[model samples]
Target: MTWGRAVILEAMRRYLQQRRAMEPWEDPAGISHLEIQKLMYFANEADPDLALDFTPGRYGPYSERVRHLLQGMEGAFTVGLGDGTARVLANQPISLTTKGTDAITDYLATDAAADRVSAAVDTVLRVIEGFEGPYGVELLASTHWVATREGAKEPATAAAAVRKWTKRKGRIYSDDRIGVALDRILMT
Candidate 1:
């Protein structure tokens, strides 16, 4: 079953708490906590069912690449894998059978390259866990709100929307638009 708003709110609160513990809280130049709270109030905007319609578009052709990028950088990608089917994978054996202490022997024989393989495995687990909708959706909602307020243009795909919205600093929007609806599913 889907979680209620309480769950989401509590999760956000926990995240904010952890963030506060990790760094000092800084008020944005002109934004107040009340304003920020009002902004996040979309958690209950039912007219559009913000939860359902927020993110839009598909992953497209290069969806897998983008998925890996986000999943790997976050590391906890597998943390969200549900369906009781996600776990670590290995491309290389970390241990060689030996007569010495098994545990120590395994540790010593561990392949450094296995770390990368493990990371890839974790990302795959995340992808598998993503077997639901309500994704690419957060972007749709954000885009709608941003566009209405900031006059930003909406792109055709989630990949495109991400490129246009997230560009800044030394980063430029990449040209790899993933195509249409089916491409998003297949690519991811």
Candidate 2:
């Protein structure tokens, strides 16, 4: 069995889209289909035919590009199932090891959510970064911590609430969308 980051990401994205009967997440306004398609292209290139021999980081420059895009957007992405239940895929450091493969990567996040999460993560790191004393400066890396509460813990909290309100249990679409919402403090 083999899988790559792009294929996995696409799979996850498709899973999210198919989970709900209708479009759950709103594609960010200014984001062109071409831009997203470009990502899809990279994702596919990572594993044409979905062999998935590599991880997201293994995708070379494409991975770095995606990371930069996510960092710049400063958004966070949360997936909401129709049950009104949801999970925020924060950028906090997460370590997952399944079977013979073990690696670390930022969970998928939308542009808007990425912004908020990135800032929050930056703040936490900055606070720790201030510790300029002793022992190799206590190295820290970007990480995500998963916590499931009754409420949406990331960007688009409102929409996610809607997802909960409209959450339905069913099937049809070959691909299910893992309903997503972005919560952010809009700037004036």
Candidate 3:
């Protein structure tokens, strides 16, 4: 079940709302565009029908559609470009325009769909509330790693899960941290 622009916009709205509440002054917009990608992953997980087409990338899970969708959101949100010097600049904050809020308000008339989105929002926010910024992204990437390996024919041993997860994530998180993340996911 592929979602339309409305679904993506609504998700962005929710992401910014919670991000602002938690971080206080991480810019007025609440999160960076990178975090939008991260939030969409969980939203898709909580309700797969969103169908964001995530695949393993250097960052663990990535979707070109996620980037394209944000590009399309031009007027609805402000996107600051990083310093022109680097291949990828520092994290740029994304805050919604008044139009963004209106987009969500209009699309939210369908209570059932809105409720599902709200669930996705709550699920993502509830899980990441304890960590901030880069660490939260690492945790989310680790969670995506566990889900990707979850369909293995046999349950992965802790040692094996650690190795696979670390292979992808070790550069970002210590092996011990990856092991702990795997334990949490498998235990759940």
Candidate 4:
């Protein structure tokens, strides 16, 4: 069902906990819609049950289904602050209402739902850790899109894939950059 949506919810909560763990609080609720995209990119990789479709699009890994999911919330889940639009933007923050809060709380209470999202959330956290904002994630997520391809593991193969994928994301990525992103997860 829509239970998979909680992957983003839990990921954002984990991120908040990480922030508060550092300084002891005041990190906000919600994460940017764009960040959620990359998070789900790695998330579905960790567990295909999410079955989200991602492709190299205007940004790194774009998911129309995820966009619809957030936008579908409309004023339902994201309305705690105010009535949010049916449309979600890359930079826009996606939050939850107490309405959403209880739904996710119950979802998390279930072992079936809880097990899937926790692994996805942790994988997303590790992939994005020590990485900067959107661009850093874009590089890594984009690199992941390439590296996992059948012939794309070697730096040279990745170079060819990047060259082909470059026009999709709007800029050229060098072998060094692609190689560097690939290097980060070699041990993992």
C-alpha lDDT of all candidate models, in order: 0.28, 0.26, 0.58, 0.69
Task: Give me the displacement of residue 103 in model 2, in angstroms.
Answer: 33
So what's the TM-score on candidate 4?
Answer: 0.75
Backbone collision count in every prediction? Answer: 10, 32, 0, 0
lDDT of each residue in 117-160, candidate 2, tens digit only: 33333333233232221110111100010102234444444333
N/CA/C clash count, model 3: 0
Off by over 4 Å in 1: 27-51, 56-162, 171-188
For model 2 the TM-score comes to 0.18
TM-score, every prediction: 0.23, 0.18, 0.69, 0.75
Residue-level lDDT tens digits of model 4 in 1-188: 36567886676666655544443433266556776788788888888878788878545778878777776665876532234455443466666777777777788787576877777788888877755455566777777887775457788887667667655433437777777887875644
Q: Give the winner by TM-score: 2 or 3.
A: 3
> Residue 39 error for model 3, in Å?
0.9
When summed lDDT is taken over every stretch of 10 residues in candidate 2, the lowest stretch is 138-147
Task: Give the Cα error of residue 34 in candidate 1, in Å.
Answer: 13
User: How would you order the candidates by TM-score, starting with the best?
Assistant: 4, 3, 1, 2
Per-candidate RMSD vs. true structure?
Answer: 18.6, 20.1, 4.7, 4.3
